Every structure is written in C-alpha cells, then in structure tokens.
Design a protein around this ligand. Structure first.
Ligand SMILES: OC[C@H]1O[C@H](O[C@H]2[C@H](O)[C@@H](O)[C@@H](O[C@H]3[C@H](O)[C@@H](O)[C@@H](O[C@H]4[C@H](O)[C@@H](O)[C@@H](O)O[C@@H]4CO)O[C@@H]3CO)O[C@@H]2CO)[C@H](O)[C@@H](O)[C@@H]1O
Length: 494
C-alpha cells in the first residue's frame, strides 16, 4: 500500500496562463515592458509553470511575403525565460478582435487582404454570400493565389521561420508547446457562429462551405456518389439564430438524417479533417526531432448536444450524432502526427446554461477527452469564458483528473496541461488571485512547482475510409461527480 502523505509526481498537471491580447501590438512593438514584467513575476510567484501567447501572422509577416520580423517576440520570449516561465506559442494564422467592444484589432497580413478585395472566395462564405476575413478557407489550402504561394506553403514557411529564428529557446527547452491554428480563434472548425454576422448564443450556426473553391470540390464529390443534382443545404437549414425544430434541416427526422444529409455532412466534416491533417503535417515536418509538443485546438460546441440533431456541432464541422462519434476521427488524425488535442471548453456545468439551449458541456468534455485518450494522444485544455469562482476552478480540477489522484502512481486519466484565460487586472485583484493560487496548488496536486518527448515523424497517411472506422460510437470513460482535490482543502471521500 502507499505511504501516508506521499503523492506520486505523475499526478501533477501543468498550469499555463494566457497573456493579454496585444502584448505585442499591431505595429510589432512590445510596450509596457515594465508592467508586463511585474505581471509575470506575480504569475511565477503564484506557482504557474508558464504562459501562452499568440504569435500573430499579420504582425510578423505584415510588410510583405517572407518579410518576417521576429525581434519583438524574441524580446517577449527572453523576458518570459528570465522570469522562469515556460512558453506555449500559438501559430495564429487568424484575426484578433476588430470590433467596437475589443482590446485590439490584428488582421491577417494586409497583402493577403488585398488579394481578397479582388477574390473574396479565399474566405469562408455563408449561403447569403457573406465573407468572413478571420481566416483563409481550407478551400484555398492548395490554390497558388498568394504571390506565387499556396496557403499551406505560407503556413509551412512561417513555421520554418519561427523554428529557425527561435532555435535557441527551442534547444534550451523554453518553448514547450506549438499550438497550430487551423481556423478562426486558432481552432480546427468552421466559422459557423460568427459574431460579425449577428450570431448569438445559442443559435444553431450556419454552414460555411459556399466559397467557389469549396463548391467546386462539392460538385465533383456529389457527382461521383451518383447524384449530380444534390445541392448544398438551402433555406431549409435556417439561419444563425434559429432553433433546430424551426428548420427543415435539423428538426427530428429532418434532412440531416436522409441520404443527402449524411453525404453532405460527411463531406463537410471530412474537408475539415483533411485540412487539419495537411496543416499539422507541415507542422510535424518543421518541428520533427525537437523536444516540443504540437497541438491543435478544438472548440467545445456544447449547445444543442442534447438535441438529436447536434445542430451547432454540425455547422461547426463536427459530425457528431447518435451512433456517429465526430471527435474520434479527429483524435485519430492527430495521432498520426503525434499531436496533442487541446479542448477549449473545460470549466462549464450543464446547470449554468439555459434549458432551451439543450446544452451538455459536461458530457461533451467526457466524450472528447475519452475519444482522445482512446487514440493514444494527450489532451490539454482551456476554459471558454473568464471565471474567478470556486465552482469553475473545481470543475476544471475534475476534468484534468476525472478519477482523482492515484497514490500508487500516474493516474488512469490525466490531462497533459491546462491554459487559463486570461492574465488580466481582474485576475490579479487580491481576493480573485488568492483563490487562483489555491487552484494552481490543486492542479499541481499539492506538490510544489517544478521535458516533453522528442517529436516523432508523422506516421503513414490514413486513407479516408480507415478514418471513418473511428466514427463507431462507444462508451466513454466513467467520470467522478466531484473533484478529489477541491479548492477549499477538503476531501469528499474522507
Ligand atoms: O462565443 C461565445 C460563446 O461561445 C463559447 O464557445 C466557445 C467554445 O465553447 C470554446 O471552446 C471557445 O474557444 C475560445 C478559447 O478559450 C481561446 O482559444 C480564446 O481566446 C483566443 C482568441 O479568441 C483567439 O483569437 C486566439 O488568438 O487565442 C486567444 C487565446 O490567446 O478564443 C476562443 C474565444 O474566442 O470556442 C468558442 C469560441 O470560439 C461559449 O461556450 C458560449 O457559452 C459563449 O456564449
């Protein structure tokens, strides 16, 4: 039996904090060096293991193609090192903010947006013809439109430049994770719930497959399945803020359940997966044989999960319904590249959401973490919304270790890390920040604060039908109903 008081170190979960947005501003200038420096001293003294920061494409490659300026990020990194903190870098090929109620606006490079003025089908496009500038459509991954480059090649070249200009932080072990942005907000999904077009929680969202590049691919696919005349969904899909039952496409027994609907949803979600696969392949080509994790971010679309149609997951690109697991195919694709699944909605409870939203974040988390662990990959996480209270910290604590601590060794089920949203003035406010220091100590399983594996070369390409073998629905791992280590110091199993 174990010795009383001895906690095996395998129980430890690393805790990272997200830096403020704009910490390197749109001009490629790192301001408030002295203030930022003191926030980092506090974070380090709170016990955090590191921080996460966006590496914005539209800052670094702003001036033109292959004109990369890393100087400001090099400074920021040197500082984070000197404060004793690890670094998670997001390859952020997307836009930050740009609204009225927004800290900062960092678009993708200006010269890419020029191309878009004359050719707006480089952007994900809804049924009505609206273009979202946040991210380049997967439609354009392999289209040589960008001053003689394709979109995948721009992502490779930027990553190569990052590796080569950060080779010392990388060999020192200062950078531990590269999150590869695969979409809006850096997430592998379609922009189906865009605030810029009127979306409001808990709308069903809308499909984003109507750019001419993606429509060409569709016309071809649908012909080869023996039905030339099958259109992408129309008015039957409804619009962003509909309810499933008010549509033909998502109502019980709606179009989503017909042969046409399945075919379309299979294609739509397969394109997302293929995009993820091609982007992480470049990442793996670049970072092979370095001691660094690569990661992709998956959004938690928890609204309408208790509806049969799972409508908001579907518009987002996750073809997850009864008897079809939509997350396990993605985890399998990730496993081919030895990458980590970062799930970005860990803190929520079902009882905190309105009943008409048919929302099930707890069950959603359990499905995705389970499916990731079953494909032999690591799963890290983040909170979706800023939260300062005990209930939220205890729910994150449950999810990082869903069967609690193991006094005989590494736990059965453990998350690889948690990145907290966000470093801010509200977080450093004395009371808030005292609770946060208890949460970190609990994340560390009452050990004191303290490396990744060498990244293997991507395994063999999995063909599309071997990936569909992964949609076989299965039972998820059993979860505890409360944490082992709540923030109040107590133990619910005396
Ligand atoms: O949109 C608000 C409503 O939707 C919420 O849904 C969330 C998902 O549930 C989350 O899984 C979330 O992802 C977050 C995530 O915490 C983080 O990646 C965040 O901050 C980003 C920034 O936006 C981005 O530009 C990038 O640079 O990195 C930042 C971190 O440095 O981005 C997401 C938030 O934009 O995904 C959606 C939103 O994408 C929520 O569940 C609903 O309850 C809420 O009403």
């Amino acid at each position: 039996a174990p010795i009383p008081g001895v906690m095996p170190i395998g129980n430890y979960v690393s805790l990272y904090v997200m830096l403020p947005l704009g910490v390197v501003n749109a001009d490629n200038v790192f301001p408030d060096k002295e203030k930022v420096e003191d926030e980092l001293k506090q974070v380090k003294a709170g016990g955090c293991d590191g921080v996460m920061v966006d590496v914005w494409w539209g800052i670094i490659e702003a001036k033109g193609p292959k004109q990369y300026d890393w100087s400001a990020y090099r400074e920021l990194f040197q500082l984070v090192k000197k404060c004793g903190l690890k670094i998670q870098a997001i390859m952020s090929f997307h836009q930050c903010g740009g609204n009225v109620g927004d800290a900062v606006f960092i678009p993708i490079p200006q010269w890419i947006l020029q191309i878009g003025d004359k050719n707006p089908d480089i952007f994900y496009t809804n049924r009505a013809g609206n273009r979202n500038q946040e991210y380049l459509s997967l439609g354009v991954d392999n289209q040589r439109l960008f001053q003689g480059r394709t979109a995948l090649e721009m992502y490779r070249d930027f990553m190569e430049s990052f590796r080569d200009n950060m080779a010392d932080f990388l060999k020192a072990g200062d950078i531990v994770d590269i999150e590869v942005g695969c979409g809006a907000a850096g997430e592998l999904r379609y922009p189906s719930y865009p605030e810029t077009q009127g979306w409001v929680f808990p709308g069903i969202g809308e499909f984003q497959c109507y750019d001419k590049y993606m429509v060409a691919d569709w016309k071809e696919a649908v012909k080869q399945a023996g039905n030339a005349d099958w259109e992408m969904p129309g008015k039957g899909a409804g619009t962003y803020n509909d309810t499933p039952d008010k549509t033909e496409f998502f109502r019980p027994n709606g179009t989503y359940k017909t042969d046409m609907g399945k075919f379309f949803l299979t294609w739509y979600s397969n394109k997302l997966i293929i995009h993820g696969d091609q982007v992480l392949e470049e990442a793996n080509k670049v970072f092979v044989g370095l001691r660094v994790n690569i990661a992709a971010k998956v959004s938690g679309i928890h609204w309408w999960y208790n509806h049969v149609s799972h409508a908001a997951e579907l518009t987002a690109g996750f073809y997850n319904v009864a008897g079809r697991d939509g997350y396990r195919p993605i985890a399998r694709m990730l496993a081919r590249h030895h990458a980590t699944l970062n799930f970005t909605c860990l803190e929520m409870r079902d009882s905190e959401q309105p009943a008409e939203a048919k929302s099930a974040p707890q069950e959603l988390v359990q499905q995705v973490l389970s499916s990731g662990w079953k494909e032999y990959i690591d799963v890290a996480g983040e909170n979706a919304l800023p939260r300062y209270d005990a209930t939220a910290y205890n729910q994150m604590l449950l999810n990082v270790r869903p069967n609690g601590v193991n006094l005989n060794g590494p736990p059965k089920l453990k998350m690889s890390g948690l990145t907290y949203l966000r470093l801010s003035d509200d977080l450093l406010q004395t009371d808030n920040f005292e609770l946060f220091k208890k949460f970190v100590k609990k994340m560390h399983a009452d050990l004191d604060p303290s490396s990744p594996a060498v990244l293997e070369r991507s395994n063999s390409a999995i063909t599309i039908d071997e990936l569909m073998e992964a949609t076989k629905g299965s039972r998820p791992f059993p979860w505890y109903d409360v944490t082992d280590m709540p923030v109040d110091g107590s133990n619910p199993f005396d």
